[PDB]
Each structure stands twice: as C-alpha cells, then as structure tokens.
Amino acid sequence: ADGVGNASGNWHCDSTWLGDRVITTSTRTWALPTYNNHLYKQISSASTGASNDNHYFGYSTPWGYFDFNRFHCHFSPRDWQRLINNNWGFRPKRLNFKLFNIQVKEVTTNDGVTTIANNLTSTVQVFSDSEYQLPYVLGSAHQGCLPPFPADVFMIPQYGYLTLNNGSQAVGRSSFYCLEYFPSQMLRTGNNFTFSYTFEDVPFHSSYAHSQSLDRLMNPLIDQYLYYLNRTQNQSGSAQNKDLLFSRGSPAGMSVQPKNWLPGPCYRQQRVSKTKTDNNNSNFTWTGASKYNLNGRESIINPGTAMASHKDDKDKFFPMSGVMIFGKESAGASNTALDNVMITDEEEIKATNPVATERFGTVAVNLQSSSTDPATGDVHVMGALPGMVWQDRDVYLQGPIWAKIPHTDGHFHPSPLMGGFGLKHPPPQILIKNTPVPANPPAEFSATKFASFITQYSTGQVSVEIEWELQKENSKRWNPEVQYTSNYAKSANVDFTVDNNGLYTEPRPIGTRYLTRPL
Amino acid sequence: ADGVGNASGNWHCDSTWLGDRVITTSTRTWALPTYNNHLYKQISSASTGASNDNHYFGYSTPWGYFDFNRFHCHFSPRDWQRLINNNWGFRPKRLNFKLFNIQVKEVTTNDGVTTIANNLTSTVQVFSDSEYQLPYVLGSAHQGCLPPFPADVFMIPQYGYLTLNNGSQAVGRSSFYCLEYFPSQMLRTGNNFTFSYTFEDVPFHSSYAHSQSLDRLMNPLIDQYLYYLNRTQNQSGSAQNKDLLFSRGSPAGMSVQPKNWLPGPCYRQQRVSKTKTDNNNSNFTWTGASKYNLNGRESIINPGTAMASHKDDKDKFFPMSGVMIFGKESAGASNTALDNVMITDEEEIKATNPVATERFGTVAVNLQSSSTDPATGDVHVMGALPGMVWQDRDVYLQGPIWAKIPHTDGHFHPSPLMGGFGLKHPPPQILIKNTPVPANPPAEFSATKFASFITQYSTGQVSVEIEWELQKENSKRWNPEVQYTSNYAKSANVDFTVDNNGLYTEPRPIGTRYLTRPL
Amino acid sequence: ADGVGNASGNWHCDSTWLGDRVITTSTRTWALPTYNNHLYKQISSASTGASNDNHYFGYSTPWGYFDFNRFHCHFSPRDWQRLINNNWGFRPKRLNFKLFNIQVKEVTTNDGVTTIANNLTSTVQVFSDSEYQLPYVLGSAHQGCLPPFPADVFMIPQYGYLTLNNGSQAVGRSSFYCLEYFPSQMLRTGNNFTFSYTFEDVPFHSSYAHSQSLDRLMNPLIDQYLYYLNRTQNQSGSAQNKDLLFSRGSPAGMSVQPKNWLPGPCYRQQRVSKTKTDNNNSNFTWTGASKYNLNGRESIINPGTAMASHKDDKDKFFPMSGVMIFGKESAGASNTALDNVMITDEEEIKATNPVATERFGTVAVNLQSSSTDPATGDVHVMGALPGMVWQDRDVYLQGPIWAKIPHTDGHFHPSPLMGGFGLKHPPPQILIKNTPVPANPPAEFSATKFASFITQYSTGQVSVEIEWELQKENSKRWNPEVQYTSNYAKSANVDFTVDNNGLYTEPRPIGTRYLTRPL
Numbered sequence A, B, C: 001a002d003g004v005g006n007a008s009g010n011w012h013c014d015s016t017w018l019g020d021r022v023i024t025t026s027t028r029t030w031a032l033p034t035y036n037n038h039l040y041k042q043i044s045s046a047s048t049g050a051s052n053d054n055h056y057f058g059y060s061t062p063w064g065y066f067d068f069n070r071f072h073c074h075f076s077p078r079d080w081q082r083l084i085n086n087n088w089g090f091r092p093k094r095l096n097f098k099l100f101n102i103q104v105k106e107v108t109t110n111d112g113v114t115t116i117a118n119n120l121t122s123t124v125q126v127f128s129d130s131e132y133q134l135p136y137v138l139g140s141a142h143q144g145c146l147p148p149f150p151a152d153v154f155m156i157p158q159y160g161y162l163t164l165n166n167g168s169q170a171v172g173r174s175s176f177y178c179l180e181y182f183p184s185q186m187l188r189t190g191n192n193f194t195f196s197y198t199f200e201d202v203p204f205h206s207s208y209a210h211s212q213s214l215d216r217l218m219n220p221l222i223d224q225y226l227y228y229l230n231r232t233q234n235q236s237g238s239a240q241n242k243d244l245l246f247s248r249g250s251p252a253g254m255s256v257q258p259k260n261w262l263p264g265p266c267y268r269q270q271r272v273s274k275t276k277t278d279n280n281n282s283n284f285t286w287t288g289a290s291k292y293n294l295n296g297r298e299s300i301i302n303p304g305t306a307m308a309s310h311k312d313d314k315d316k317f318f319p320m321s322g323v324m325i326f327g328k329e330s331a332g333a334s335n336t337a338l339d340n341v342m343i344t345d346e347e348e349i350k351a352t353n354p355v356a357t358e359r360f361g362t363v364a365v366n367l368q369s370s371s372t373d374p375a376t377g378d379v380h381v382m383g384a385l386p387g388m389v390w391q392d393r394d395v396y397l398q399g400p401i402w403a404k405i406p407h408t409d410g411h412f413h414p415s416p417l418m419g420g421f422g423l424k425h426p427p428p429q430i431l432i433k434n435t436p437v438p439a440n441p442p443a444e445f446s447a448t449k450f451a452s453f454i455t456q457y458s459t460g461q462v463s464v465e466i467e468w469e470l471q472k473e474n475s476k477r478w479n480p481e482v483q484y485t486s487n488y489a490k491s492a493n494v495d496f497t498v499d500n501n502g503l504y505t506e507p508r509p510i511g512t513r514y515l516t517r518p519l
C-alpha cells in the first residue's frame, strides 16, 4: 500500500548542521522513458570506421539508473560555501534512498495529436545491485545525475555497459548480464521503494591548502649539524684546481640543505596556453599527448596524476589533459570555444606536488672522472619513492563524489584520479525500468517473439539523504584566511541563479581548498 | 614408542570438499641418502672461472630437507580442475605434517656385490626451524618437492645455503650455521614425528579473469559532463590556424575520455618469437636482457613484474624472461629444444596490466610553443603511481605456492614475483638427516677426526595435510564461462597419466584464471 | 600393536549350522609379489595386431587385490552337499574380513644363489574401496580367488582396469585412477587389518527344480469353461469346406488350452554336439555365433539368457556359448581337448525357460484370406512380454557368488547373467600392495625419478567369514527327491580329494538344484 489517490512520500529537502555533522537531503522529480522498446541490444564500434583505439563491445539495456554522484546534487552553493570556508575536511557516513509518488502515463499518438493518460495498473521495477554483480558505470562522470537546482525535472539515464573486446568483436571471456535475472521490486502508483547504505571508513578529504612547502620547512634562523659537498674545484688560487670543500646547512642556502622528504610522484604532461598565439601551430592534442598503452589501445592519461596546474604567476597555462574541465551551459558537444568551458586550477598543491608541465627533477646519468665529464638528464616520469608525500586532486561543487575501487589484486593509493573517495563497496547502482505492457495480441496463438507494446513512461520524485562528517578546524593562525566569497561589485545577474528565462547557471567551479594548515 | 614390527602411521591421502573448505592430504614415500659423508663443506664459485655475475660463497650441509611447495603436491589434476572451474579464489589456512614408518638400511658393498640390510638401532633426526633461524631455501623453485603422482618414490634434496660474498671470497659479516646446534628429535623404526602450523592471514589468490578492461569501463550510451582539449589547430578555414576547441566525453571517443585509474606498473622486456625466422640473428639472451644491478653483479629480472605475455591475437610471441617455463619430462639440462618446455601465457591480465614487450605509454618531454614543437618520448619503465591497479602473476598446478617475504625494513606489495602467496611466517623448513654410525674404531685412542662410517640410507612415508579456504563465485553472468576441459577428441594417451612404461606426465601447465568477474 | 614375535591372528576356519543360518569362515595363507616394479603402466591392444573387436585401453597397477567371489572359497564339498540337498534357497547376510601374521621378506639374488631374509621394518598397505570409486573387476570370473582346498597357498592377483577406448587409443572421457590417492592403512609384522560389510537385501537363490511345467499346470481330470477355434475347414462332407467349429479346453488336448502365463524370454543360440561327427565341418565358433554389437565391436553373448541347455533325452548337445564351462586341472590355456573341461547342464529349468538352441515359438506373419494363405515364421529372439515367468541360471560350487549391478539409468532383472546375486553395493574390493623400499641412493642429490628398490615380497593369512541365511524346505512331496551323492562304486581316487602327488581336484561341477518345488 497504500492507494491511488494517496501520496506515497513527501518532499524532504533541507540541510542540517550539527557541529561535526551535516545532513544534506535533497529531492528531485524525475521522468523515465521506455528504452530500446524493452530490448537488450548488442552494440559495438563495428562498422563505425572508428579508430583502432576507440573499438568496443557491449550491450545496451532497457533499464534506467539513478545517479547522484556529484556534490551539487546534495550541497547548495551556499552550503558548499559553509563547508569549504570552515572545515579542514569531510567524508560521507551513511545515506538514505527513496522512490515515491510514482505515476505511469501511456501516450497514444495519432494524427500528430498525441494524448497522455494514466495507466493506473502499470508497474515500475527497481532494485539496488547491493552485491555489485553488475558492471559499475557510476563514477565515470556521465550526465544524468540529479540536477543542481531542486526545481529542475530530469530524465533518468539509460543503463549500458561494456565487456572484453578484440577490435569490434567479442571474446570467449566476455560477459552478458540480464537485469531481469535479479530479484526486483515492482511498484504501482501507491507503492514506494526505500533503502539505506552505510559508507565504509574512508580518509577525510583534504579541504585545505598547505601554508608551507616541502623545501621551505626548516628553521630560517639556525644552521644544521650536517654538511654537504659544496665545491669540487677550489675558488680562485688564480687557477682552477680540483678540490673537496664542504659547507654546512645554512639558511643562506636552503636549496641545498639535507631534507627528510620528497615531492609527490609525477608523470609529465604537455603544456598549452589560453592565448593561442603562444601555442605551436599544429594539432598536438593526440600527437604530443601523454597516453598509456593497454593491450594495443592507447588512451589519454586524463587528468592523471595529481600535479600543480602551473607554477606561481602563470594561471595562464594548463596541463593539456591534467585538469578537470566543466562546460558552461552554453558549451556545445564538440569543438566548442574556450569561453564555453571552465578549466579547474589545481595550483593549491604546488607546495607538495610537482608541477604537471615541468620535469620532476634531474638525475645523474654517468660516472664522472677527470677524463669524462659529469652528465645528467631530466626525469619526466617518477614513480613512488620512499619518503614521498603528496596531496590528492581536489573535488568540486560540480565534480564526482566517489568511484568504485576496481576489484584487482593490488592497487596503489586508490583515490579516484579525477577527484573523490575510493570505495571498496560504494553506494550501489539503483536500477529502474518500466515493465512492458503488451498491446492487443493476435486472436490466435503465435509463438514468435512479442513486439507490440503500449507506449508509456513514468514519473515521480526521488529523495537522497546523506550524513556527512565534518572535521572542524582549529588553526592557531593569526592573520585572516582566504575564503570563497561572491563578488560584491554590482552586475546584471547573480552567481548560481536563474536568468530571465529560468535557466539555472553555475558560473565557476568551486574547489574546497581555502583554509590553511601547516605541513 | 612403539615397536620394530609395528607401523607408526597409515597412508592418509584423500581430498575433501566442504562448501567453502577443501582439505587436501597427500602422502608420498621417500628415500634419504647420506650427504657429504656427514660433513659440512665450504663451497664457492672459486676456481670455476665463473662469470663475474655468478660468483657465490656458501656451505653445503649433511642434512636433507622436505619441500612440498608446489600445487601438484596436494591437488590432483582433477581436483585442480574442480578448484579453478568453480571458485573465484582460495588460500591456505592450516597444515599438518607427519613422518613415519621410517626404516634405516645399511649397504655393504663388495666385489661389485652390494647388500642391503636393516640397522634396527639407527636413528634419523628431524626438526622444523619454526623460528626461521636458518637461511630459507624453499620458495626458489628448486627440484626435490613431493612428486605429483602419489605412486612415485622420491629422493630428499640436500640442504645448502649461501651468504655474503665478494667474488669467490667471504666477508666478515658472512654467516655459517651448524644444524646440529638445533634441538632435533631422533627416531628409530618405531618412532614418528608430527607437527602442525597455521597460515597467516593472506589475500585470496585471484583465480579469475576480468570481463572488462580499465579503458572500457564507462557507459557506452552516455556522454560525460567533462570536457577535454580536442583541437589546437582549427579544422579547415582553408588555412591551418591556432585554436583551442574543446569537446566533451563521448562514447564515440572512449580513448580520450577522462578516467579514474591507471594500468599496472611496468618494466619493459624484450620480445622473442616462437618461430625462429622472426627473431634477429644473434644471441641477445643476456645482451638485450632486462637486468637489475645489485652491488656489481647483474641478474636477469625473471619473470619480474606481472605483465600480459602478449597483446591480443599473438600467442606467438613471449617476454624474453617474463613468463614461467616448465620443462616437459623430455627436456634436458641445458639448451634443449622449444618443444621440450612449456611456456606459460599470462594474457588473462591484459585487461588491467601493461603488455610486457611494449611501452607502458608516452610522456611529454618539453614545453611546446609557437617556436618549439611539442615532443614526447616512450616510457619503458613505470613505477607505482597513485591510482594504479593491477593483477598479480597467476599460479599453476605445477608452480610455487608460497615464498617467505624477506625480512627487510620495507617492501611493496610483497607477492612472490613468480607466483604465490607472500608470507611473513611461512611453513617452516623441515630438516632431516641420518645420524652417523662410526665403523669399527682403532683399538688404541686417536684424537684425530673420525672419518670411518657405516654406509646407510633411510626411507619412510611423509604426509602433508593442508586446509584450504575457498571463495565461491556468484557471478550474475548469463552466458557460459570458459572452463578448463580435457580434449574429448580421441588420442594415443590420456592427459596427466602414465604411459606404457609407467612414466607420469603433465602435458600442459594449468592456470587458475577461467571464471569471470567484472572490474 | 602388537609385536614382531607375536601372532596377530589365529586360524579361524570352520562352518556352523544354526537352523536357518550357516556361518562359513575359511582362512587361506597368501603370497604377494611386487608388481610392475611399483609402477603404474599404460597398456593397450596397440601394436598387437589384435582383431578389431579385441582393442582396449587401460592401466596396469602396482597393487594386488583380494578376491573370494567363488562358492568353493567358503563351502567345502561336503557343506555344499548339506546345503543343496536340504534347502530351497539361501543368500548372504553379512561378512567379515581380516589380514594377519603378515611377514615381509627381501630377496637378494646373486650368482644364481638367491637368499630370502626378513625386513622387519617394511610395510604392506591395504584398504577397501568401500565407496566404489575404483573400476570394479571382481565378478568377471578371473583367477586368483581363494583356493578351494584350505591347505593351498595362493598368489594375490594384480589389479588392472580398463577405460573408454577408440581402437587402441584413449579418449577425452577416459579415466585414470591412482590408488595411492586413497587413504590406506600401513602394516608391519605386528599389525593386522579388519573390516566388516553387510549384504543388501537380495532374493534367495532358487536352489530347487520345478516339479511341473508351464504347459502342464492344469487339472488333468476336468474340462475348461473356455472354447477355442478348433477347425476352419469342416471334417469330411466328402468335400473340404470352409467353416468355424469350436471345441472347449479338454484334458485330451492340453497343448491347445487357454493358459495364464508364457515361457521365459529367449535369444537363440547355435547348437553343437559333444561327438564331432554330428557337427558341421567348419569353424563356426565366431562365424555362426550369437554376438551383440556395442559401438563397432562385436562380443559373443556368453552365457547370455538363462535357457535350458538341451531338450529332454539329449544331454549330448549344448548351446555353443550358453553354458558355463570350467576346466579340469589338466586343461591348458587354449584349444584344449573336450575331456579337459567340464560343461555345466542347465536342463533343470526346461520346465519354465525356453531351450537355448531352439526357436522360442511361431508367429503369424500375414493376413490370411480365401485368396492368400495363412503364413507364419519362427521367432528366434524374444524380449520380455507381460505374463512371462522364468528361472535364473543356477550357481555352482566353483562358480561366482555376486557381481556389481552396473550403475546405469535402468536395468532389467539384474541377476548376473553367468550366475549369482546382483548387488547394488557388493563387498568392496580389498587392495593390497608392498610399499617400495629405496635401495641405497646416490651420495649426491638427483631429481630424476627413483628407480632402484630393495626386492621384496610379503606373505600372511587372510580370513573371510560369511553368514548365510537358509530357506528351509517343507515339501509335502511323498516320494523321495533327487539328491547329490558321491558314487559308492569303488575306484582309484576319492572325489574332491588330493592324489598321490598332493594335487587337489574338483571332479565335476555341482549345481544347487536338486530339491523339488511345484510351480
């Protein structure tokens, strides 16, 4: 239960702050079509003339899925502000899902005149793959998430997946999943669906920027008790003579003092400028791109290793594929102008992580001697070395929240490369589909496959509640900190607001790293 | 106790399946000679003219050791089948050892006519180095393990070890262990030895292959909300002009979509072909071999990092030293023909791990600009990078089970590089030796070292029971999976069977990765 | 336990009659060699030039097996007499096995002079395949059973088996069993082995002959109330005219009276005479032999369906392969003279079962009419028809006792075709083998297979006790019955006795069907 003329759920949609806790609960109203005419279909790069690196094999499903894996699905711009401006970190604790006031309509089109009526007896099916038995497509930054603006109605994305492929063909080990082979709950107007999940223990997300840097971590007023080789050729003597002179760590030469740690790992990336003139005249997008080679296919590393987007005084350049880029509502599908996208800046970590477009360092390459000169080389790729420390890619008000850690034998610091929390057991995929309704069948039994169905779609609200744990700050810093603030200068439109046509717009990407914390 | 005419143990040798458990208990009958005439001997590469990389210093011991560190010591071919075809993983829990029905014979050779009689009062000594105070030689894939075929009698290997060396000489820090300086139990016909060990907590071995690949892990039906730099030179305009055009993650271009993870680490290896014609005419075996340099000595990395043995459609090539190779019973000591060995194929992991003979990827090497062109380089060696995930080298019916994690300050994902479980405290080495029996001594005291002994050997059965924990599968996959199956086509001999001469033969190497599991 | 100088079992060997029960317990002393040098060997018809019907593939084992599946292993001639002369039936209830006073000797041959000494520490292994996991070879009438005469020492047969074969090659589904892969008990002089089994419920064996026949089962003094068509052409009328005259069952014409049952099933067999002159001059042994065709191979049906060996007054002929034939102790391997074998006579069942060399009957083959004449044919093969009744092949003092009912989906009246009791779970196969004893091994470890062993054999007594259930008789018959009796007429030797050289001899085959019982 209960009934047809009885709401099966209310509009819960608030935000509650409780010291070290904050419950965000937002509800949006959705629309679900009938996909593929209730058919599972094999799909492939086959006959697309697709590049060799773009081949793929998989299946498109008749099911739709719920996806709220974006911060703006839960935090209003103002809340996000509250969060990033006063806390050193946060993480998800537990969540709550709910489907209600579901209504199934049946459209009868004819003579251009289409009519929409209720089919009070139709059902919609749901089920959460809580045992992760289906391929996981959440956490690949796809569209179809809950809209940022509560007053927006959205369309549920269609669920499709991929599997092992050799060119545009499949292989023996390829897998095909049928979602109807999963116990799922059926609903009619008066029914509703609910379910709760608990997040696994996960590190707080570092919502702060360091107020010191690895190199500058010593006492500016005092020497060290350590010495380093300072000269191998004596100064003057009106001749250049071989020697071995040592000096001891001085504040006057911090760049040469023995230290305890190393910058973060790094996989260098090409650098491009926001002013076309500076760029080389060619299309190096794929040519000079940092790609990884997985079984014959190349794939751009994007955004790849967390690295400072640019060195100080140069928010002019950016890693060719080392920064998150969101599109403004104006941006088109492909080859859209620069001012139609928003490129994130990850320079807040230049204090501990290597800059993405530069060399990580220099390495000795030979054995110097009186007869052969000491040579070196530039290291462009650097794996994990003991003593390394680093910061992970920051998250954004419109970025991903989590991603499922692949189920592999081993894995290194599994933090989703494009921002987020790495979960061994993430929130499960919620699958929904309209059950088929056979149109009038022949008056004489026919065994051939049924392919005539009442055309219909469904609609209802969905509520998602998440309890977040805050990590308050207690900086003993004396001077004011940086804080996200809307510009007070007058203008035609207000940031994160609708316009004269009712189109909600997210002007810029907001990070979370404003508050300071020493190393 | 008990007595001379009383069996001190029975032939336990079965296999029991209990849902998530499986107890394999196999017993073989052994033969132990007298090694080195009861003498400890110093040994070295000294005076062998041995290469510089082959020098070594150590001691050969009068003791023998038990070694059952190979899967076929416990699993029959059929059992192995049962295992690999229905479980997603497994691991050792606890074991049980037992020595019994020991008999000591004394051979009296003369005039070519040798006679073997029982020495009812002789003793054999045993002891398990359960405190790991002796150099560990198990887990280096040596011969001498329990035979695969239960009906085979085997000879216990002789225990020898190495220590620090400088060329063919020793050093101050070198160590010399005397096994008689360990409390050991002595046995006569009527005695027996028993002992049980419990395995440490260890990850299940991944006995499955992925049904998806890192690159192809997204939803084939939906776009992303992320954008990437698509062109840096505008298309057409009857002129090639600098630009900055962005596109957004589309299914039509998966190879360029921002992702969350990276392929596994990699240390490139040379590639050789099974058809000599394709190979270069030279002996690059050591020349172009991937070697590591540890204190003046070079050593081939073999099999090294877990990497796909070859890309799709090429089970024709193989890493020069990146795959396990077992010899057929026909194979000789050295320089034996190809068809006398069996080369394992590790292509089951090409979904997550880099191919061993190819570059891991491409890296930007400079700072492009209108005046200087964007250049890149091929990365042949790649250390651990955050966001990396990978699969470990599979194990084989005739491969190692475990290896002792070296006792070092640090260590990375310590999974035995040539397959197996890394144990901090592995099953201890079981040492056995025939106690010396002085031949008739002079009738007048002489202090010089005793060197006249009754010639004798011993024999008895040994039982090893291991309880394995299974990780059942619950794949919601719809289509049939791949499964190990003996070929049904008729032939002269049955696989894993004796021939007309009674020689047991293991036709091919069986892996464990057949079942599928999505990423 | 217990000890070396301590007997581990006594010589139980009696027979006890207890009304409706009879316990036969006999013990014989055995000798077991080392077979195949402790090697499992593949064996086949390969390269024997063997006929197409004689191909086979299998393995010969290093194990020996105990077999007491012959009545004379338990019943003395006199006991057998007691049994067959006073009981209407009998069957096995429960049994008891025991191995003891086992002694292992080690032969050292040299210079033609061979010496046999005790190896007080050697072991012999035993185990009963009580789960029927090994191919069953008992119940195929092989030699190697316990000797009839208690004072005879015997050699344990070697255990070998067959499996699926295509010509002289094997197939995928072929099976290879290793007996060392079975938990088995080990014994030294002072040890012994014991085990008891309980027979399944099985029909008593019909140890009687019918004193009536199917056709002659009515009242000789009275008519029937039924009528039958007696003539279709009127008698006389000085002309032969069509008619329909009926008569009623009269004693004067029993051969035409309606009856209630039918004779037994039948598969006709060629007939041969004991006096060569009567036989056709050719070698029809295989030519005109009744063979069955199972997958390309032909096989003689022998002895096949239970049928009377010959009609009354003709114990001169016999079914070419429809009667059991035992060889006198004089008979050779092949092509031995008639008077060197003993051919059983199964005429005791001619009262209910069809004679083996004749047609089962006659059948109408067409539709007679004034224009076409009524024709018939001889039926040579007759399957089970409702209303059929029959007697099974009798057993002999020197015949089989039981056989294992094959594990097949279905099976018809599974009474072992060559006499005996069909058991779903028969007494298990008892397997015994001498454990190998490595001769002196090299003084330097060698991984190659061990192939040097102390030559030895074992010996001991074996006791088998069986409790049989008797089915006493209560015939109200007035006249004396037939009874097995030794001839009283004087002669040179006594039946079932040793001769002047100590050779026990079984003069004739004794059945069990002497007593009478009406239908």
Ligand SMILES: Nc1ncnc2c1ncn2[C@@H]1C[C@@H](O)[C@@H](COP(=O)(O)O)O1
Pocket (backbone or CB within 6 Å): A200, A201, A202, A203, A392, A405, A413, A414, A415, A420, A421, A422, A423, A424
């Ligand atoms: N930023 C981060 N750094 C390290 N680990 C993180 C992380 N975010 C999430 N994790 C994961 C969550 C858990 O999966 C844990 C790893 O668990 P397991 O893979 O060994 O079974 O750390």
Ligand SMILES: Nc1ncnc2c1ncn2[C@@H]1C[C@@H](O)[C@@H](COP(=O)(O)O)O1
Pocket (backbone or CB within 6 Å): A409, A410, B200, B201, B202, B203, B392, B405, B413, B414, B415, B420, B421, B422, B423, B424
């Ligand atoms: N495949 C695998 N991956 C990671 N660890 C493994 C492994 N197999 C065994 N181990 C080891 C077993 C334990 O030694 C544990 C490491 O323990 P510790 O060296 O820090 O004291 O992980």
Ligand SMILES: Nc1ncnc2c1ncn2[C@@H]1C[C@@H](O)[C@@H](COP(=O)(O)O)O1
Pocket (backbone or CB within 6 Å): C200, C201, C202, C203, C392, C405, C413, C414, C415, C420, C421, C422, C423, C424
């Ligand atoms: N002379 C005989 N007639 C009929 N059955 C006999 C028999 N002798 C033995 N049996 C078997 C013994 C049991 O196996 C029983 C059949 O059992 P199941 O094969 O249906 O499981 O009848």
Ligand SMILES: Nc1ccnc(=O)[nH]1
Pocket (backbone or CB within 6 Å): A409, A410, A411, A412, A413, B412, B413
């Ligand atoms: N960071 C890690 C250390 C060891 N093993 C892993 O899988 N990951």
Ligand SMILES: Nc1ccnc(=O)[nH]1
Pocket (backbone or CB within 6 Å): B409, B410, B411, B412, B413
């Ligand atoms: N994987 C590892 C991380 C940190 N320390 C180690 O020894 N190993």
Ligand SMILES: Nc1ccnc(=O)[nH]1
Pocket (backbone or CB within 6 Å): C409, C410, C411, C412, C413
């Ligand atoms: N006699 C029989 C009747 C039915 N089924 C059988 O297997 N046997």
